[PDB]
Amino acid sequence: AEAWSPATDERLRAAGIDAEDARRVVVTALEEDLRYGADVTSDATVPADAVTEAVVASRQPGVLAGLPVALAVLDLVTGGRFEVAECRADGDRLGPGDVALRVTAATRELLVAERTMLNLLCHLSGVATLTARWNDALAGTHCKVRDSRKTLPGLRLLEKYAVRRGGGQNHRLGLGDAILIKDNHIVAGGSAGAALQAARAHTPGLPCEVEVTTLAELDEVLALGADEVMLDNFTVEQCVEAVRRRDAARTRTRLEASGGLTLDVAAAYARTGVDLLAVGALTHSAPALDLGLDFAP
Amino acid sequence: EAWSPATDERLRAAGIDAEDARRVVVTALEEDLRYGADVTSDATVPADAVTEAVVASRQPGVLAGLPVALAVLDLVTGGRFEVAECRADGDRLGPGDVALRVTAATRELLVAERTMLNLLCHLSGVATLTARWNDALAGTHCKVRDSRKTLPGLRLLEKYAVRRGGGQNHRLGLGDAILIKDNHIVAGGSAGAALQAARAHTPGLPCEVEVTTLAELDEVLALGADEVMLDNFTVEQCVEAVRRRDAARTRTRLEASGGLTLDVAAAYARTGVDLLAVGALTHSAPALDLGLDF
Ligand SMILES: O=C(O)CCCCC(=O)O
Ligand SMILES: [Cl-]
Ligand SMILES: [Cl-]
Ligand SMILES: [Cl-]
Numbered sequence: 001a002e003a004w005s006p007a008t009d010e011r012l013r014a015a016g017i018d019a020e021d022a023r024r025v026v027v028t029a030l031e032e033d034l035r036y037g038a039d040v041t042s043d044a045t046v047p048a049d050a051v052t053e054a055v056v057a058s059r060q061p062g063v064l065a066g067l068p069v070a071l072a073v074l075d076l077v078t079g080g081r082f083e084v085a086e087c088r089a090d091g092d093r094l095g096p097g098d099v100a101l102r103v104t105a106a107t108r109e110l111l112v113a114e115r116t117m118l119n120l121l122c123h124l125s126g127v128a129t130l131t132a133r134w135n136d137a138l139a140g141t142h143c144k145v146r147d148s149r150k151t152l153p154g155l156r157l158l159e160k161y162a163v164r165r166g167g168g169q170n171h172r173l174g175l176g177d178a179i180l181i182k183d184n185h186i187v188a189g190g191s192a193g194a195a196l197q198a199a200r201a202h203t204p205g206l207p208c209e210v211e212v213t214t215l216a217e218l219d220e221v222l223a224l225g226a227d228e229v230m231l232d233n234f235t236v237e238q239c240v241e242a243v244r245r246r247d248a249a250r251t252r253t254r255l256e257a258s259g260g261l262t263l264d265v266a267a268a269y270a271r272t273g274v275d276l277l278a279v280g281a282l283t284h285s286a287p288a289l290d291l292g293l294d295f296a297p
Numbered sequence: 298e299a300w301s302p303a304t305d306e307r308l309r310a311a312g313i314d315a316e317d318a319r320r321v322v323v324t325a326l327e328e329d330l331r332y333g334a335d336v337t338s339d340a341t342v343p344a345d346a347v348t349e350a351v352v353a354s355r356q357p358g359v360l361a362g363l364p365v366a367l368a369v370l371d372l373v374t375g376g377r378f379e380v381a382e383c384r385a386d387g388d389r390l391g392p393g394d395v396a397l398r399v400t401a402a403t404r405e406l407l408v409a410e411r412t413m414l415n416l417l418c419h420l421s422g423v424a425t426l427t428a429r430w431n432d433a434l435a436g437t438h439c440k441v442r443d444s445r446k447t448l449p450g451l452r453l454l455e456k457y458a459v460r461r462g463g464g465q466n467h468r469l470g471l472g473d474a475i476l477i478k479d480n481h482i483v484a485g486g487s488a489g490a491a492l493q494a495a496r497a498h499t500p501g502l503p504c505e506v507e508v509t510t511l512a513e514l515d516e517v518l519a520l521g522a523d524e525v526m527l528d529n530f531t532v533e534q535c536v537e538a539v540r541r542r543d544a545a546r547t548r549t550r551l552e553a554s555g556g557l558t559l560d561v562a563a564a565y566a567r568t569g570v571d572l573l574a575v576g577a578l579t580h581s582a583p584a585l586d587l588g589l590d591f
Binding site for chain 1: 329330333450473576583
């Protein structure tokens with residue numbers, strides 16, 4: 001059905017969704033479902049001229065994300081022949097039974113679109129829902145939660161979007177848009193300070209963060225006025241000490257805790273005064289939110 | 298942007314679709330490289346540096362995706378890498394067990410590693426969760442199967458990982474088997490009518506029909522349905538369903554699904570049903586924690 005309508009492109013861009021990446025994801029997903037042939041079940045049991053109303057409804061409480069992409073799927077499958085009666089916005093809180101979308105379209109085309117629409121909605125809503133749980137554990141502090149490059153293959157930009165819809169902040173998108181010095185770079189470079197100085201000199205225009213595993217490495221990069229330091233697998237007490245040394249250096253380096261973190265210790269870490277938590281699980285281990293598509297009776 | 302014959306051979310020996318795997322790998326590398334080169338490593342790691350690297354598990358689980366991770370490394374290095382040691386997909390790993398030992402240019406490992414690990418940790422996570430469902434079903438004849446609730450773009454690799462965890466696949470897509478769902482019956486008005494229409498249309502294609510009530514079950518058992526999916530039946534309703542199937546004396550295979558979770562898996566396996574269809578295997582599998590250490 002080759003590409004959807006410009007109205008759908010505008011809705012994707014209005015939402016901050018990368019439209020070319022979303023097209024690749026959608027076209028690929030439909031292909032996974034249709035490469036063995038037409039929908040035999042529906043073609044045998046549903047008339048070609050049937051049209052129906054359908055409701056996308058949540059079965060669990062959580063945060064909605066990906067509804068513009070699901071509409072792009074339906075737009076593509078129907079060639080634009082659908083009408084929306086009702087829709088919630090990405091970022092909205094849903095409870096069980098809440099209706100996220102009500103649409104009318106040819107019944108056979110809804111049956112083809114349904115599973116691709118839901119696989120996208122449920123995963124992205126699951127990401128935004130988990131992100132919101134982490135963000136809520138940070139209430140009462142100024143701490144924020146951030147994601148990582150531990151995304152699922154092919155879904156990076158959509159999952160980064162979902163993290164934003166859940167109240168999280170995006171970490172860098174790839175290897176070339178920001179520096180993140182890690183232990184292999186510190187070993188190679190000769191010290192934490194040497195790696196930090198080499199990165200600053202090689203690409204002075206990029207954001208620069210250095211990950212440390214010890215308080216000794218932290219002292220080095222504070223002495224060089226690093227803008228942002230990732231504290232790798234620090235205990236809560238080591239974070240308090242790290243924050244103490246940061247406050248005394250009066251460089252106002254941002255501190256980001258990472259590694260060894262779970263939702264039940266997130267509030268404890270935020271209380272130490274670190275500025276950020278970096279959480280891989282937001283994208284690599286987010287349980288899907290259970291949404292279903294139900295035809296009108 | 299092509300890998301070696303040795304990799305095509307590896308993927309085929311494993312039963313992995315190579316064209317799909319190429320699409321997944323190339324797409325995933327582009328996600329990481331579209332903003333420019335690995336500026337961090339280019340500033341700090343010598344261009345001539347070479348290192349051995351170990352993929353090791355931090356947690357117990359089942360390995361899956363290792364030939365795909367090697368295809369990533371093959372592409373990034375242009376074939377310039379040495380394998381010293383490898384486990385096989387489907388092997389059980391414990392903490393510290395070494396899945397893979399390779400030697401390559403250090404900068405190329407640093408470009409390859411996160412793509413390799415995103416694939417390896419996800420697919421091993423799918424296989425690991427599948428294996429836990431299989432363990433809960435041990436001592437019964439009930440088997441676990443997956444579904445079309447796969448992450449977009451990852452269907453064939455995720456279905457592969459379910460098999461490596463000891464699970465069954467059913468339909469790969471919409472076209473390869475008939476599965477009459479609740480929405481088909483809503484649209485038609487009758488579960489028995491939908492079954493007969495499907496049977497008539499393509500007599501040799503096996504029909505599975507999904508029911509939500511014991512009265513619907515009665516209706517399709519009377520028509521001699523070959524396979525019935527019990528949608529959101531409780532444990533007690535499945536026992537009742539097995540009873541009515543036995544009383545109707547049909548050979549109908551019974552499958553249960555609908556929000557199934559691991560803490561009730563072992564109970565559902567003792568209802569008499571033949572299969573549990575579990576969406577969570579593919580849409581809610583926690584990643585297996587694997588790391589790559591120089
Ligand atoms: O949408 C389909 O084609 C199958 C969906 C199975 C029912 C569900 O959403 O739980
Ligand atoms: Cl935004
Ligand atoms: Cl950044
Ligand atoms: Cl196999």
